[PDB]
């Protein structure tokens, strides 16, 4: 019975999804996946199916897990020094403290999984978020789950 909820992994379509995520955990997880037509849902849901594996592994620490997509929240991306080496992106933010800390190993569970440790074990290099406010968010459709269009 004394169980903590199970976790979401929730895409960013609103400012309040985000931000309550954000201030609702210590930690929130930010993925920034390829655009759809980079990867069609195949490659999109190889790495959702990585983020959903390793939210489990580390579902006691309570944390935030949010995706986006590249381009679909631009300020964002800036705030957190992404969008330079491509896609797909990791970041995890303090909200309390304001900063962040970028993945810079492969986004695989091996990569991430390495990334997490470090910072379950607080021993790696933050920064502030860009302008130590909250991004702007903007609200966008949830995806559908194909292979986008064009």
Known sequence: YFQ???????????????????????????????????????????YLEVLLKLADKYKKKMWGWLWTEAGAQSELETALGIGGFGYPAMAAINARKMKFALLKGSFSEQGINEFLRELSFGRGSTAPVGGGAFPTIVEREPWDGRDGEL
Do not use: F, M, W, Y
């Open 4 to 46: 903590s909820p199970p976790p979401e992994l929730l895409e960013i379509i609103n400012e309040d999804i985000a931000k309550r995520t954000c201030e609702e955990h210590q930690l929130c997880v930010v993925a920034v996946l390829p655009h759809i037509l980079d990867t069609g849902a195949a490659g999109r849901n190889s």
